[PDB]
Structures are given as C-alpha cells and as structure tokens.
Amino acid sequence: MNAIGNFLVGTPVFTIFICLALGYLLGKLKIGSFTLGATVGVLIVALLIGQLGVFPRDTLLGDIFFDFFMFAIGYRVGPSFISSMKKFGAKIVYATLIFLVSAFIVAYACFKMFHIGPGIAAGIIAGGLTQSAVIGSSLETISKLPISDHLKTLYSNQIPIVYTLTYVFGTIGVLIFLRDIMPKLMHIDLKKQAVKTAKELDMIPVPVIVASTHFYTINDGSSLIGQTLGTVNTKFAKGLVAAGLNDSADMASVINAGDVLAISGGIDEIGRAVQEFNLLEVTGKTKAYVSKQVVLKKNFSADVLKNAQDKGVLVATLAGDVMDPAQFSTLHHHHHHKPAESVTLVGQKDAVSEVQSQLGRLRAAENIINYSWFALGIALSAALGIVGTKVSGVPIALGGGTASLIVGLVQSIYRDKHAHMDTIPDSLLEFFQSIGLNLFIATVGLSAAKTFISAIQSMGISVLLIGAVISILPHIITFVICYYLMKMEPISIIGAQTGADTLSAALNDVSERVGSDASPFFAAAVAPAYAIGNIFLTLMGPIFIVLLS
Amino acid sequence: MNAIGNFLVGTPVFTIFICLALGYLLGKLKIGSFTLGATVGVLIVALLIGQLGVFPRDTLLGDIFFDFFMFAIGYRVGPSFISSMKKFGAKIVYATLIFLVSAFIVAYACFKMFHIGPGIAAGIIAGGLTQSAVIGSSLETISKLPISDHLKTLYSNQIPIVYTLTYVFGTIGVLIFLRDIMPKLMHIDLKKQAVKTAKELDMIPVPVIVASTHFYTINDGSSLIGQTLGTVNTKFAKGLVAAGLNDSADMASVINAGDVLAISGGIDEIGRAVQEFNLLEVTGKTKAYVSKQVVLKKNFSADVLKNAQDKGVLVATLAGDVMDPAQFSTLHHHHHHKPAESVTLVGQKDAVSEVQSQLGRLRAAENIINYSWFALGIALSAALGIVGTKVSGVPIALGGGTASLIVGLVQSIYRDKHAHMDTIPDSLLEFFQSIGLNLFIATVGLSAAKTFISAIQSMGISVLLIGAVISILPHIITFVICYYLMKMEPISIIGAQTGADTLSAALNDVSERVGSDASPFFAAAVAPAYAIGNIFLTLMGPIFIVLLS
C-alpha cells in the first residue's frame, strides 16, 4: 500500500490519467434510472485513489483544463447566445436572483440554529454551493476582523476542512437532483425537452436536399445533340443549370455525341430532367466541378447573383439547397448588425471562381483548426479572469469560469461575424468540454481525498447533513417557485439553477445528456446565471463569516 | 518592464498561451524559401518573452503535452507501421547506427582539440543533439567519479548552461537543414516525394465510386408496374440490387403505380438502369434505408454474404464501392494475424440488420471519442517511460518519447485488430501532435531564456559554434553516406536522421509539411531510429564525461 503510494505520487501523470479512465468507465456504467455522469465517476475514482497517499494539486494544470472547458462552452454558444438571451433573459435572471436570495435565507436560518461558527459556516457555504473562492474571500475577511490570533487560525483551519467535507455532496447530490429528479419531477425527458426547446429556436435546421452536380453521357440519338450548351441551360427550368458540356463552361460549344453534360441542381429536379431527356448518368471522372462557400461582401450588386444561372453557376443556401432567385433580396444588408449571409456556388471552376471574386471571399472550412485563435482565446480568458475589485473590503474576481465564458462568447461571435477566418472544430470543443472539467475534478479530488475522510471523522456527521440540506433545499424552493408559479421553460429553469449554483459538472453532464443540438441553448441559459451567482456567492461567504461574530 | 514581468510570472496561463499564439503566427509567416515551423516560431517567441523575468517550468504540464504529442504520433502510425518496417527497417537502422557512430566520432575529434572539459563537453552533447536526459546521466556519472567536490560542482553547473546554449541551435538549425536544405539537396520536393512514397505503399487508397441507394417514383406506364420486387431485383444485373419497393424489403409485393423503388448500387450502373427503364428519380423522404459497416466474425459462412443481393442488401468494401461477388473469398481468414476485414451493408433496415447479425458486429464510428482508451493510453505511456535500467552505473530510461511511441503503436494496432471499439478522431490526434510539442517547447524556452543569454555572455562564442558544428556535421556525413552510397529513399533517410537525433520538432514540422497522407510512413521511419538514438545518446553523454578526465 505504501509502495503503491510512492509509485503514485512519483508518477502524477499515471495517477491522474488512470483516474480519468476508470472515471469515464464508472460514468458509462448504470443500472436503469439514467446513468452516472462521467464527471461523477472521475470524482469518485479520484477521491478513492487519493486515500492511498498525499497528492499535490497543480494549479497550472487543473486551471488550464477548466479554462479549456469553459472557453469551449462559451465558444460554442456564441452565435445562438444572443437569441436565447432575448428569449428568456428576464426569466433566467429572475430565477438566478430567487435562488440566490433563497439560498442566503436558508443558510441564515440553518446557521441561527445548531452548534454553529463562522469558519464552519463559511466552509459549509463554500462546499455545499461549489464555490472555491468563498474560501479566499471569507479568509481575508476573518483576517481583517478584529479577533485574537488563536480564533483566526482556528477559523482558517476549519473553513477548508468543512469545504472539502461538503464539496463531494455539492458536486454529486445536487447534480443528481438537477439532472434526474428534477426533469422527472417536471414530467418531461431531458433529451427530448431540450432538443424540442432548441428546435423552437432557429439553431436546429431541418435536412435540405443537397443541390449537387451530376454528369450524363450523351449517347447517340438525344434531342440535346447538335444543340448549344447555352440553349440547353435556357431550356433547363429553375433549380437546374447546365454546369457545362464535357469539362468546359462555354455556353457556345455545340453538344456532340459521346460528350458528358454536367448539370447542377436538386435531386428531384435533376431526376425529372433525366426522365424527360432520357439521360444516361455516369460517375464523372472530373474534379473541375467544385462547390465553394462564399461570404458576400456588402455592396455586391446581385446582378451577378442573378446572372449566376445564365453563367452556369448554381447559387444555393449555405445549407446546400438551391435558393429561390427572388430570395437574392434577403441577402440585402441594411441598417447594421451584420451577420453576413453566405452563399454556395456550384459549377465550373472558372465560372464559379469569377462569380465568387465578384460576390465576396471564400469561407474557411471548419475542419481547419485556428491554433492562434484558440491560444489568444485562452490567454485573454486568463487575463480577464485575473481582473477583480473589492467590495466593502471583500476581494472578488471573475475567476476562470465567468471570464472564460465571456471570452468564448465574444470570440465565437466575432468569428461568426467575420467568417473568412478559421475556427475550432466542434469535435475539439466537445473534447475540451469533456476532458478539461474532468481533469480539474480529478486533481481537486485527489487533493481533497484524505482531507474528506478526516473531516468525516472530525465534525463529520452533523456538518455533512447540514451541508447537504443547504445545497439541496435552495434548489427545491426555487424550482417550486419558478415552475409552479412563473411557469418557465423546464430546460430554461434547469440551466438557470445550474448557473446560479456555479455547478460546472452540471453544465458538462446535462450537455452530454442533451446532445449538441440544444447544448447551445442550455449553455446560453446557464452563462448569465453563472456570472451573477459567482459574484453573489463570493460576496455571500464573507458577509456570513462577518455576521457570525 | 518589471511590472510586465510581475504580471507575466503571476499569470503563467497567459504567458504560455500568448507564446503559442505569436509562435504559430511566426510559423505561418515566411519569405519564399519555405516557411518557419510553428514549433520554431513558438520557440523564438518563448525565448524572447522569457528575457523579461524568471519563469518556472512545470514538469506536470510540458510532460503531459509531450506525452500527448508522441502518443498521437504513435497511435496514428499503428496500422501502417508494420508494413513500412518490413519495407525499410534494415535501411533505417543502418542509417541510425551510421549517424550515431559518426556523431560519436565527430564529438570525440572536436573534444580532442579546443579548450575542452567534461562538463562543457556533456553540455554540448545534451544541447546540440537535443537530449535532456544526457544531463542527468552525465551528472550522476560525474557524481560517481572520484574528484574533488569543487570540480564536481563546477561541472554540474557548467553542463546545463552549455546545454541551454546549444539547445536553441540544435532545435532550429538542424531542423532547417533537414527540412529545407536536405530535400533540395536530394533534388526532390518534401510534400510530393512523401506522398508518392506513401502511395507506393498500401495506405493511400484511390477514390472509389460510392455505391449509394437512390429512389425512383414509379410513374404510370413503366415496364416495372405489376412486376414483383423480386423479379425486378433478379432483372437487375450485378452491382444493382432492388433495395425495395416503397419502404419495404418484401420481394413478393407487386410494384404498383405511384410507389417508389429504392435501388442500391454504383452510380454508373444505376444511371444505365435508369436510362434503360426510364426511371424518374426523387429525393426520397425516408431514413429506413441505411448503410452499416460490419466487422466479419471469423467463421461467417459467406452463404449469407452470397445471398445478400438475393435478399435486397448491397455488400461493398469498407471504402464504399460494391465488391465483386467472387471477392467474398478474399474475406477468408486463415492461418493467423487477423486484421479482420470489414464489409458495408446497404439496404432496408430489417434485411441489412439481419445480414449484419449473421455476418458480424457493427463497426464503431471514428467520430466517437474513446476517452477511457485515450486516458489508459497516456497512463501506460507514462508507466512505461518511467521504466529503466542501469548500464555500467549509468542510469537510462525509455523516457516520455519512446514509451509514448510504443504505447501509441501497440494501442492503435490493438484497436485496428478489434474494430468494434471506438477510437480517437484523427483531427484530435493532429491537434495533439501540433499543440503538445509546442507547449513543451514554450515552457522549456521560457525556462531557458535568460539562461541562454547568460551562456552567450560567458563562454558563448566558441561553445555555440562548436555545438552547431557537432549538431550539423553528423547529419551531413550520414546523409552523404546513406544517399550517395546506400541509395535509400529520401523521405526514409530524413525520417531515420530525425529519429536518430531525437529531434521531435522535426517530426511535427515534417509531418505538417508532408500532410496526413505520408505522415504515417514518416512516423514509422522515425520511431525505431528514435528509440535507438535515445538509448545510445543517453549512454553517449556519460561515456564522454568519463573519457574526459
């Protein structure tokens, strides 16, 4: 057991990554009533392994990875954030403030009764509400408070112990209440309700007929023979444009026998045209027919957007389906706001390239990774989380969470505004969201493992129960209020309570249960509540440690 | 300048991530004769920023990220490794040993002349050949050596200084010689030569006609009306199988007017069938027609693989193109080795599902991420890099590099053998390869920044020139030998020299210049040379520090 501990402490990489492996395993496992979050599995694994020896927490590792997690969350919700805000901002901020005042009142009422102290009280606050800066705030506060050095040392030792005692439950029990008990209580399904709430907003588009380019070998005896490519393109209805005979786009070459006519358009229209002209389709050994996404530069005329078809170029929505000609006027640009609309040009390389150069600039493929963009994002997230101020002598700061969310939001919004620059693949963003918070949790659990059982031994039974009460009851009361009176959206209420409590494990877990469809809406509903609750709790800890004097 | 330094040292996250942003920028920039590696840009940025204050290097950060980089390299080359080995293993190991003996002889000849000492000699070795364990080996060696404490302290202080002095050049100049001067010297292009060398091996398949399922509305007046689906499927030649009338796979329902016949097969064959039967194509609003990749369980009969077509199921290669019926015998499984071949089943959900259950199990989509697999991989990479032994009192160990490469190799090979389990997306693997080594470089450069200029001031001019010579000349001599005599593959020689020198920046840079096509072949050509050179250099440092006495 001690050789195990020596090897472990001497190999932190292995100690931490084996914590994540078994953690994700425990998360995957389940009995029936939903499953355990990968985050919760990693937490359990880390708290158990930490019982072997002593494990020093790196604050330049868990910090980096929590930054990754929150910046990914913020960078995914960038576009859909403003809309979900304009939709439910009033309701979500009301819920956040209701939960905050209810938590304050509950903590005050519980600390009025029971053997209670200011250090233990601040520890219960920091632990049961999942706030690791309340410790620092209340510690500096009690330092400023005019008390004997012995009492100050006593409280400064008591606070972190009770924090780690209540932290396990503040992370697990509240998560299980918000993710499992709370949906079933509102008589809904988390996944279905979330995906339908997101569909209700313009962020989950429906499938579209991809307007592609087919190739047809002109066998002998067809009415198209001897006829000019331009004449055929004219004969083609709307949604169908003759991409070109053979591999050229000259609308003057005569269609001869044995050539290959390429046509761009929707599948149904192309099938009808094939039946009418009895066309023989062929694989088409040619790459000279490519589709390109172009971001329209304001003041683009549209005369070229109109002559697209007459030029052998199919213009379609960014989704893919060929766009109605009149809809060229929805690409108007007026007033300001400027989320530039993007077109898709299909056809011959020369014609498509000229129409693109006339319309705008090529949109960057999401598959490409903008390493410098990601690096600057993380750097500025850190620089903004370091920012802070003092309120009544209490030091407060955005911290990693709120600053990372804000930087992700603004950076994703700017990238969506200027779509010519590369971005971060959503696969990488999901990987960050999943791995960063779980590494943070593994480190903090390895650090607070032995401490947790020590606190269970000393002042364990009563304090842990009081902390569980303080953590769950505010959620119950604010949920009752919100749902049964204000009648807010269930997923919106869940996001608001997850934010107001600063429970980042809830973010990750509810997102992985809801899927990448309504995950943007959930993150949007969380972010503002997250910031407000972070501030008010970092201030709530010290006011309590002062009141208790 | 000092407020800058205070803010920087107080915000390591920002200090490191702004180093990566500007680093990737400097890498992107270029004049004409190729560009600067993103790694080299990050190195320059870190060495310049480090000139502000003092920056402590986290060994549980750079270590994790270098592990990520090397494990990604090893996990991508898993499948293609064994083949490239069987192809050029003799040549690559010959090149590795030739380079090692030439470097040893060059170092000995240069240390015989010039004001030379054992500490400075070991420092030049550790710096100009990019080996940060030579420091530890030679330090423990000189510790064991029976000398006055003053001399031991003198040498132990001299070694790291000369190491950091020569490290910048060992990372930049040798990289520029192997990536730019060396290809042009062999009169080739790195990208083209690499991609064609990889094409020469079965790892870059050519495009294939994707055998898809089309839908055709049975207008009135077609010869298929009143005819049974089974009869039509029979009438369909090879490569064409009637997926089913409407949305069912019963080969007894009569084809009525207004129904929709779905047909699976290649585009050319389907076009010929459409022309012959004058079929009207339609978008097809149905998901009940799906394609599934199945891993064949040994002892699968093939009778079902034969009845696939007669059942309304198109069997195709994993690539997509419908496979020749006789080729069902290439899916034989015999002897052992067992890289189970996978089929693709297209058609109706019920028929395809039954044929799959009869043939094998569903292959996992690469888009899914196996977090537990990745975690266990990193953990075991660390546990294996910790392994080591002693040779003549010299401590040696696999370290992070060789152990991570071995674990990646074996884990990727096992996942390719058992394809039912998820994997790591190649996008994530590329992101790791790019970001991990560059973070390692940023940290080590921030740490060795002030030290580098200090060493430039003290014993700077002569030592840096001698180190540049020791670093470049071995490459020149071994390249001459290999190319102009042994006549090995250019890309193979480059990979062998990159491995033998333990220059991980060369791995990353040459891979990003060659692309994901021949990058597996390059990593395969590197790995063995990497291990052998790592060992022989960790042993070469101490033997030199001993000889110099």
Same domain for A509 and A398: yes
Tokens standing for residue B97: 């040993």
Cα separation, B536 vs A1, in Å, equals 36
Q: Could you report how far apart the first and last alpha carbons of chain B are, in Å?
A: 45
For residue B386, the chain A residues in CB contact (below 8 A) are 10-11, 14
3-state secondary structure of A174: helix
B275:A280 CB<8 A:
yes
Residue A131 lies in a domain: yes
Could you give the maximum distance between any two Cα atoms of chain B, in Å? 105
Tokens standing for residue A5: 């501990």
Cα angle, residue A527 at apex, residues A522 and A532 outer, rounded to 5°: 135
Q: CA nearest B449: which of B22, B47, B2, B127?
A: B47
Same domain for A62 and A153: yes
Cα separation, B242 vs B236, in Å, equals 7
Angstrom distances, CA of residue B530 to CA of A133, A136, A318, B403 = 46, 48, 46, 11
Q: CA nearest A533: which of A97, A201, A235, A150?
A: A97
Buried b (16+ CB within 10 A) or exposed e, B13-44: bbbbbbbbbbbbbbbeeeeeeebbbbbbbbbb
CA torsion A448-A451-A453-A459 (nearest 10°) is -130
B382:A216 CB<8 A:
no
Which residues make Cβ contacts (< 8 Å) with residue B512, sequence separation at least 6? B37, B38, B434
Look up tokens 């607070």; give the residue: A448
Which residues make Cβ contacts (< 8 Å) with residue A73, sequence separation at least 6? A404, A405, A408, A433, A507, A511, A523, A526, A527
Residue A508 lies in a domain: yes
* Neighbour order of strands in the sheet with A280-282: A240-245, A260-265, A212-217, A280-282
Same domain for A430 and A535: yes
**Can you say whether residue A338 is alpha, beta or left, with left for phi > 0 and alpha for psi between -120 and 50 degrees?**
left
Cα separation, A538 vs A123, in Å, equals 12
Cα separation, A314 vs A291, in Å, equals 9
A14:B367 CB<8 A:
no
A282:B268 CB<8 A:
yes
For residue A218, the chain B residues in CB contact (below 8 A) are none
Look up tokens 């080590």; give the residue: B444
Provide the CA B173 distance to its chain's centre, in angstroms.
23
3-state secondary structure of A466: helix
Q: What are phi and psi of B280, to 5 degrees?
A: -95, 115
* Resolution for this experimental structure (Å): 3.5
Q: Which residues pair with A185 in a beta bridge?
A: none
Q: What share of chain B is helix, strand, coil (3-state, %, to 5)?
A: 60, 10, 25
B282:A267 CB<8 A:
yes
Suggest the residue from A57, A216, A371 to mutate for an interface test with chain B (most B CBs closer than 10 A): A371
Q: Which of B24, B267, B425 is opposite residue A371, by nearest beta carbon?
A: B24
**Can you say whether residue B424 is alpha, beta or left, with left for phi > 0 and alpha for psi between -120 and 50 degrees?**
beta
Q: CA nearest A20: which of B30, B79, B363, B380?
A: B380
Q: Which of A60, A209, A427 is opposite residue B283, by nearest beta carbon?
A: A209
Cα angle, residue A441 at apex, residues A439 and A446 outer, rounded to 5°: 95
Listing DSSP states for A73-137 in one string gives: HHHHSHHHHHHHHHHHHHHHHHHHHHHHHHHHHHHHHHHHSSS--HHHHHHHHHHHTT-SSHHHH
DSSP A19: H
**Can you say whether residue A255 is alpha, beta or left, with left for phi > 0 and alpha for psi between -120 and 50 degrees?**
beta
Helix B12-28, helix B2-9: angle, nearest 10: 100
For residue A268, the chain B residues in CB contact (below 8 A) are 281-283
Cα separation, A294 vs A317, in Å, equals 10
Cα separation, B159 vs B138, in Å, equals 9
Cα separation, B178 vs B483, in Å, equals 13
Cα separation, A106 vs A113, in Å, equals 11
Q: CA nearest B509: which of B71, B72, B171?
A: B171
Q: Let me know: does A247 contact A288? Beta carbons within 8 Å.
A: yes
Residue A388 lies in a domain: yes
Distance from CA of B25 to the nearest CA of A (A): 7
Cα separation, A46 vs A58, in Å, equals 15
Q: Which of A58, A282, A425 is opposite residue B271, by nearest beta carbon?
A: A282
A369:B434 CB<8 A:
yes
Residue A499, exposed/middle/buried by CB under 10 A (0-12, 13-18, 19+)? buried
Which residues make Cβ contacts (< 8 Å) with residue A58, sequence separation at least 6? A12, A443, B58, B60, B61
Q: Which residues pair with A74 in a beta bridge?
A: none
Cα separation, B21 vs B275, in Å, equals 57
Cα separation, B531 vs B96, in Å, equals 10
Q: CA nearest B504: which of B62, B136, B158?
A: B62
**Can you say whether residue A80 is alpha, beta or left, with left for phi > 0 and alpha for psi between -120 and 50 degrees?**
alpha
Q: Strands A260-265 and A212-217: what pairing?
A: antiparallel
Q: Let me know: does A409 contact A81? Beta carbons within 8 Å.
A: yes
Q: CA nearest B541: which of B106, B95, B123, B155?
A: B123
Q: Tell me which of A319, A339, A362 is where a domain ends.
A: A362
Q: Tell me which of A362, A382, A401 is where a domain ends.
A: A362
DSSP B299: S
Same domain for A338 and A411: no
Same domain for A275 and A178: no
Which residues make Cβ contacts (< 8 Å) with residue B469, sequence separation at least 6? B106, B110
A378:B25 CB<8 A:
no
Q: Strands A313-317 and A342-348: what pairing?
A: antiparallel
DSSP B369: B
Q: What share of chain A is helix, strand, coil (3-state, %, to 5)?
A: 60, 10, 25
Q: CA nearest A401: which of A63, A175, A109?
A: A63
Distance from CA of A447 to the nearest CA of B (A): 15
Q: Let me know: does A224 contact A255? Beta carbons within 8 Å.
A: yes
Sign of the Cα pseudo-torsion (B355, B359, B365, B371, in order): positive
3-state secondary structure of A169: helix
Q: What are phi and psi of B243, to 5 degrees?
A: -55, -35
Q: Let me know: does A299 contact A259? Beta carbons within 8 Å.
A: no
Domain that holds residue A292: 212-362
Same domain for A380 and A418: yes
A283:B274 CB<8 A:
no
Suggest the residue from B6, B260, B269, B275 to mutate for an interface test with chain A (most A CBs closer than 10 A): B275
Residue type, position A448, single letter: A
The nearest alpha carbon in chain A to B443 belongs to A60
Q: CATH number of the domain at A320, please.
A: 3.30.70.1450
CB neighbours (10 Å) of residue A303?
A: 10
Q: CA nearest B122: which of B174, B173, B160?
A: B160
Same domain for A325 and A217: yes
CB neighbours (10 Å) of residue A60?
A: 14
Tokens standing for residue A184: 């079933």
Cα separation, B272 vs B270, in Å, equals 5
CB neighbours (10 Å) of residue A134?
A: 27
**Can you say whether residue A227 is alpha, beta or left, with left for phi > 0 and alpha for psi between -120 and 50 degrees?**
beta
Same domain for A401 and A538: yes
Cα angle, residue B157 at apex, residues B151 and B159 outer, rounded to 5°: 100
Tokens standing for residue B362: 């569903």
Helices (H) and strands (E) in chain B, counts: 22, 12
Buried b (16+ CB within 10 A) or exposed e, A367-385: eebbbbbbbbbbbbbbbbb
Cα separation, A136 vs A147, in Å, equals 18
A216:B271 CB<8 A:
yes
Same domain for A293 and A261: yes
CA torsion B263-B264-B270-B274 (nearest 10°) is 0
Distance from CA of B409 to the nearest CA of A (A): 18
Cα separation, B194 vs A165, in Å, equals 58
A430:B267 CB<8 A:
no
A376:B17 CB<8 A:
yes
Provide the CA B543 distance to its chain's centre, in angstroms.
33
Q: CA nearest B265: which of B219, B225, B231, B216?
A: B216
Cα separation, B496 vs B26, in Å, equals 28
Angstrom distances, CA of residue A544 to CA of A159, A169, A371 = 12, 21, 44
Q: Let me know: does A295 contact A363? Beta carbons within 8 Å.
A: yes
Q: Let me know: does A266 contact A239? Beta carbons within 8 Å.
A: yes
Residue A28 lies in a domain: no
Q: CA nearest A432: which of A440, A442, A443, A444?
A: A440
H or E element: which one contains B263? strand B260-265
Look up tokens 């503040």; give the residue: A170
Tokens standing for residue A277: 């002209």
The nearest alpha carbon in chain B to A16 belongs to B379
Q: Let me know: does A381 contact A403? Beta carbons within 8 Å.
A: yes
Cα separation, A207 vs A460, in Å, equals 56
Q: How determined?
A: X-ray
Q: Strands A360-362 and A342-348: what pairing?
A: unpaired
Tokens standing for residue A171: 């992370």
Which residues make Cβ contacts (< 8 Å) with residue A151, sequence separation at least 6? none
Listing DSSP states for B11-26 in one string gives: -HHHHHHHHHHHHHHH
A431:B67 CB<8 A:
no
B427:A367 CB<8 A:
yes
3-state secondary structure of B306: helix
Q: CA nearest A548: which of A119, A102, A165, A100?
A: A119
For residue B383, the chain A residues in CB contact (below 8 A) are 11, 14
Same domain for A175 and A90: yes
Cα separation, B522 vs B519, in Å, equals 5
For residue B283, the chain A residues in CB contact (below 8 A) are 209, 266-268
Overall number of domains in chain A: 2
Q: Tell me which of A313, A338, A362 is where a domain ends.
A: A362
Residue A20 lies in a domain: no
Residue B453, exposed/middle/buried by CB under 10 A (0-12, 13-18, 19+)? middle
For residue A280, the chain B residues in CB contact (below 8 A) are 271-272, 274-275
Sign of the Cα pseudo-torsion (B6, B11, B13, B17, in order): negative
Cα separation, B207 vs A493, in Å, equals 50
Residue A456 lies in a domain: no
Cα separation, A224 vs A217, in Å, equals 11
3-state secondary structure of A292: strand
Q: CA nearest A533: which of A445, A474, A464, A485?
A: A474
Gaps in chain A following residue numbers (C to N > 2.5 A) = none
3-state secondary structure of A167: helix
3-state secondary structure of B350: helix
Cα separation, B265 vs B242, in Å, equals 9
Q: Which of B11, B17, B379 is opposite residue A18, by nearest beta carbon?
A: B379
Angstrom distances, CA of residue A192 to CA of A189, A490, A498, A519, B282 = 5, 11, 19, 12, 31
3-state secondary structure of B344: strand
Same domain for A336 and A415: no
Q: What are phi and psi of B277, to 5 degrees?
A: -90, 10
Residue A19 lies in a domain: no
Same domain for A186 and A217: no
Residue type, position A233, single letter: N
Residue A451 lies in a domain: no
Q: CA nearest A514: which of A498, A531, A502?
A: A498
